[PDB]
Amino acid sequence: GSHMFYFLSKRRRNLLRNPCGEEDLEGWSDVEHGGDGWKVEELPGDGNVEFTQDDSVKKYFASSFEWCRKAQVIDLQAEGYWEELLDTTQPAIVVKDWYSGRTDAGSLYELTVRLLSENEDVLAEFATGQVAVPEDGSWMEISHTFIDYGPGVRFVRFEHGGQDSVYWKGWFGARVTNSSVWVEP
Ligand SMILES: [Cl-]
Ligand code: NI
């Protein structure tokens, strides 16, 4: 009620802008448009129809027949995570993403998240490599929690992407949405 655990718990919030495409590609950088590029689409066109545990999620980004990628760099200090706190406490940095594909074509997904120093030094890294998206159209979560990452972390670089497995014109690639980065104690 006055301790750091309480405050970090209270200030926990997604630090990624525009996680679902409500603002199109706004807030996303190093946007790479492989094939026909990224396209924001709405939930239930139907199919497998899952997106459970969060009904606020209405849209997703769909990738095409060559890699579509996009990234965001989060300034932890600017969001109020004190340099001293980051350096000695190294509080949990939790990154999550949701991906799915179509039932009429396979697709691939990849996530790379890095903790960077003030000068873009790569201090920590989580990387999925290329991942087979579920054939049945279901949404899959990926989650990684960075701990014990050492001093000097200032930025979180979140990068993800998708492509189809069929090389077809249109948007048959991996779909991504509800991406998150937050700090917890
Ligand atoms: Cl949140
Ligand atoms: Ni307290």
UniProtKB/Swiss-Prot annotation:
Its annotated compartments are: Cytoplasm; Microsome membrane
Any GO MF annotation of the entry: carbohydrate binding
Feature type site, description Important for carbohydrate binding: G47, F65
User: In terms of the whole protein, what range is present?
Assistant: 117 to 297 of 297
Q: Which organism is it from?
A: Mus musculus
Q: Which residues bind a carbohydrate?
A: R102, T103, D104, Y167, W168
**GO cellular component terms?**
cytosol; dendritic spine; endoplasmic reticulum; glutamatergic synapse; membrane; SCF ubiquitin ligase complex
* Record keywords: Cytoplasm, Endoplasmic reticulum, Lectin, Membrane, Microsome, Phosphoprotein, Ubl conjugation pathway
The membrane topology term of the UniProt record is:
Peripheral membrane protein
The biological processes this protein is annotated with in GO are:
ERAD pathway; glycoprotein catabolic process; protein ubiquitination; regulation of protein catabolic process at postsynapse, modulating synaptic transmission; regulation of protein ubiquitination; SCF-dependent proteasomal ubiquitin-dependent protein catabolic process; ubiquitin-dependent protein catabolic process
Oligomeric state and interaction partners are given as:
Component of the SCF(FBXO2) complex consisting of CUL1, RBX1, SKP1 and FBXO2. Predominantly detected as heterodimer with SKP1; the heterodimer with SKP1 is not part of the SCF(FBXO2) complex.
Q: Which domain of life is it from?
A: Eukaryota
Q: What does this protein do?
A: Substrate recognition component of a SCF (SKP1-CUL1-F-box protein) E3 ubiquitin-protein ligase complex that mediates the ubiquitination and subsequent proteasomal degradation of target proteins. Involved in the endoplasmic reticulum-associated degradation pathway (ERAD) for misfolded lumenal proteins by recognizing and binding sugar chains on unfolded glycoproteins that are retrotranslocated into the cytosol and promoting their ubiquitination and subsequent degradation. Prevents formation of cytosolic aggregates of unfolded glycoproteins that have been retrotranslocated into the cytosol.
The gene that this protein is the product of is Fbxo2
Free-text disruption phenotype from the record: No visible phenotype at birth. Mice are viable and fertile, but after two to four months, gradual hearing loss sets in, due to degeneration of epithelial support cells and hair cells of the organ of Corti and spiral ganglion neurodegeneration.
This protein's pathway reads: Protein modification; protein ubiquitination
Q: What is this protein called?
A: F-box only protein 2
Q: Which residues form a coiled coil?
A: none
The main location class comes to cytoplasm
Q: In which tissues is it expressed?
A: Detected in brain and cochlea, in epithelial support cells and hair cells of the organ of Corti (at protein level).
Q: Where is the FBA domain?
A: 5-185
